[PDB]
Amino acid sequence: DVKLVESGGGLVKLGGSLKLSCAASGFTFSSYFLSWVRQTPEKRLELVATINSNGDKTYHPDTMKGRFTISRDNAKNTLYLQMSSLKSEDTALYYCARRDSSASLYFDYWGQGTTLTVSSAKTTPPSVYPLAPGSAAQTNSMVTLGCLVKGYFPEPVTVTWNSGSLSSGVHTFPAVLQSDLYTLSSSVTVPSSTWPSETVTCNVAHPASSTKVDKKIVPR
Amino acid sequence: LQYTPSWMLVG
Amino acid sequence: DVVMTQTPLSLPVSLGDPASISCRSSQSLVHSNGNTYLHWYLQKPGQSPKLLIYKVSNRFSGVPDKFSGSGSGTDFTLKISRVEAEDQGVYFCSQSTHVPWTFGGGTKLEIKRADAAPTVSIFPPSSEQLTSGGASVVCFLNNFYPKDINVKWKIDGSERQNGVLNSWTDEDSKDSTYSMSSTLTLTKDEYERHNSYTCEATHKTSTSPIVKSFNRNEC
Secondary structure, eight states: OOEEEEEOOEEEOTTOOEEEEEEEESSOGGGOOEEEEEEOTTOOOOEEEEEOGGGOOEEOOSSSBTTEEEEEEGGGTEEEEEEOSOOGGGOEEEEEEEEOTTSOOOEEEEOOOEEEEEOOOOOBOOEEEEEOOSSOSOTTSEEEEEEEEEEEBSSOOEEEEGGGTBOTTOBOOOOEEETTEEEEEEEEEEEGGGTTTSOOEEEEEEGGGTEEEEEEOOOO | OOBOOTTTSOO | OOOOEEEOSEEEEOTTOOEEEEEEOSSOOBOTTSOBOEEEEEEOTTSOOEEEEETTTEEOTTOOTTEEEEEETTEEEEEESSOOGGGOSEEEEEEOSBSSOEEOSOEEEEEOOOOBOOEEEEEOOOHHHHHTTEEEEEEEEEEEBSSOOEEEEEETTEEOOSEEEEEEOOOOTTTOOEEEEEEEEEEHHHHHTOOEEEEEEEOTTSSSOEEEEEETTOO
16 A cells, blocks of 8 residues: 655754654655645644655745755655754644645645654653642532642653542543643542542652652542 | 645646 | 635534535635645544545545535535544645645534533642642533633632643543633742632533632631
8 A cells, every 4th residue: 555654753852953754655656746744732734845756846834944854765765854953833743745646736645643842851750739629629429639740741641540440530631831841630520428538549650750659639 | 926836736 | 825714613513414614715726727726634533634625626535425525716615414423523624726735723523412511620729739839729620511611710809820721621432521620820929928719610501600719718
């Protein structure tokens, strides 16, 4: 089949540089145009660069201009993208992409894409804080508790209640940048009889920094 | 404005 | 370059129903060659987009007949006759008439279900946290539908002190509901110099904002 494969993503310091590859099997590379497109962490748009066959012609919008530079090696079935003064707004999933040959100007084949994160953040473990309701939390039947897993880097973190014995009623909000560092929450809902009567503990782990933490939600 | 160029439309 | 504006940004549906996504470029899309380079792509949770339709209304090899597209110049429409589960994801219209090529904000097909009110809970900052000199006040808006919702933070009856980060869970696979959390971070100091803290929300499902609140001096 037609299969393009992006690679070389990872973490880079700001203003840094990095070279993404895109290997293209299952077809005549020298024939097609290709591009790199990307998706903002908020899930968007994104044309970066485009190149002809036996690449003597290239296009880069004006924004990308200077930070990004496309190239190919028909002699080798590989397209690339040299990046150079990475801003953090460049963090995104990088797709490799093939143009239909009928020139109808649309991409018929995409790769899985490489991830890229531009942060100068250093590996920081997170601070965990329990979240007791203090105020009722609906002394109805359900009573919600949470864990605020705060300011750590890089992603990802893992959180569980009662070692995983707690699966129901548990939400875990996707992370967000609190400055240059991640913050995330996790919530659990349990029957009023259940707590404070019985223990409820949030487990947190952040392998990039060798952290495991348990935090007991004791009433206040 | 900036329609798409001749090249790119080649093939 | 041209702003591809899609509508609506979110679309709730029951399988079997059918839908229409609009897409509206800023400048016109007729290229100086009569071709109209407007396409449609689908992105499935976790995959690369896949082209559905090109040149306004040309089905791509293997795109079921339920799908069809039409339009002229600036306005365009994607239509789906009976939605299958397979049809759910984010849909995008790109254009290629003008360089650089652009894509729309995307449009989301999501399951329709009954309206559901959110369960709100607010939490005072932990002592652990204070000890550190930061103070985070959290508010959980749980399991509610539909998606739209708003949340205001008051402090001593006024609206917020800056560090509000919101966060959304995606639509849930079991009960099709949504959830969100909002956190207001403050210094320990500005925290200690105010007593009432308000998490306030509005969602159609209530004529009036739902309000969870708590005073600092009395836990």
